């Protein structure tokens, strides 16, 4: 075997790549250091010998790096490792102890070859991350980048991790060399007034795609946990990016909802017949609105959980906004358009929407029920004004045929009432084009109106009965009617159970002839419907013609309808004021 005598030979060996001889190249330098410190040696010779050393050492370098740029060369990469350490520690040798250099020599010795390597790893991490791979130039850049880095670090943990010794940290050096390059190309875009779409794609990337899809979800996963890389953009700048993105998107859905509303507004305006699933659908506004919201919420869920929650609490306010300005536009629709062929039809479509809002917002937001109801307020107002507007026409046709109980001094109830049932049942049809929930919600309204109206008639102090027999006859009448109403309404979709004992129980107060009895049906009747007051008790006893100072007694009951335990009176007598 060797060594190699002439420096010519050695140079020739380096030139043919062979690095057994790398050790000799250092030996020379060491020898020079020797021959110098022997004193006896020309300066004119020192310079010669040193120029030759450092020239050889340049060559050696370019061979080692030449190998390590593309570690797919062979197995004398162990050689290149060995040398990229011999010189690395020789650096430490000639610190300040080998550090005296006789002049004419020119110090060269912190050579820092491992650092050179890092420079190359980094320069290759930047040749590859920068190759030419569209959603955007930016998003295509990020794509190609993330891909390339996942790929390449996968290669390093797969193949370069067993070849490199522990001193170098192959892995840390590679991931960090790529990582920092990524973060550089991002820091570059941060120095810009960027588009909204751009803000979202880079925020997504930093916050979600990078650390999950690349750093964490692969097989790389396990390794880089050790590395502990940071963000791409810096913390403060990321939080700033959030803060502006929110305002972007929140503004997007604000404007978009606004436009949805405007457009449906004109559908009404334009006498568009709504389309019918089973009851009418203008759920156009319903689902189109909730879709705007859901997609915004996804977009801000697709960064952080916290970006998400922030945009939720932030969207509540603009939803409130919309609903409010919706009620207003529907109301204005009511007030003006009316001749329109699909005025009532439209109304029903809109009323229908409330079901979907209730249903979807109860599941989506998970808010307190007073917060829920606080948001949902102007939908009741819309459904209120809705119902009031469709019904209004039948409540009028019904206005005289109730006077006719008073007009005929209750001569024949059942005929008058049958006229009313006819006049109401001739309205059942179109109200079937209305959501089932609201169907029965409206039936309670009609039911209630029939009962209120009846009790308003009996309380009009416009019939006094002289003798028990006709009070019993009147009772039989009332009861007949109460069974007609309760039956028909229940049978047509009302579930207003509370109303059922309204009329029958009054018939009983009319019919009952003995004092105590009347006191007891009064007690019980205040129990069902406790908004029943002395006012009504009077107007009812007015139709009694006997009993004059048992009035005082029967009334001193009602005198304390005061609960204090629970106050849940569904309005019945609240709504019937007679003085």
Residue numbers in the entry: 67 to 199, 205 to 650
The article reads:
We recently discovered that M-Sec, a 73-kDa cytosolic protein also known as tumor necrosis factor alpha-induced protein 2 (TNFaip2) or B949, plays a central role in inducing membrane protrusions during TNT formation. M-Sec-induced TNT formation is accompanied by actin cytoskeleton remodeling, which requires the association with RalA, a small GTPase, and its downstream effector, the exocyst complex. We identified a conserved, positively charged surface in the C-terminal half that is essential for M-Sec interaction with active RalA and promotion of TNT formation by extending out the plasma membrane.
Although we could also crystallize the full-length M-Sec, the N-terminal 66 residues are disordered and the corresponding electron density could not be observed. The structure consists entirely of α-helices and intervening loops of variable length, organized into a series of helix-bundle domains. The domain arrangement of M-Sec (domain A: Helix 1–4, domain B: Helix5–9, domain C: Helix9–13, domain D: Helix13–16) is similar to that of Exo70 and adopts a straight rod-like conformation. The calculated electrostatic surface potential of M-Sec revealed a positively charged surface that covers both domains D and E, where conserved lysine and arginine residues are widely distributed and exposed to solvent. To test this possibility, we introduced two sets of mutations that would decrease the overall positive charge in domains D and E: One set is a quadruple mutation K531A/R532A/R533A/K537A, and the other is a double mutation K470A/K474A. These results suggest that the positively charged surface of domains D and E is responsible for the interaction with RalA, which is required for subsequent extension of the plasma membrane.
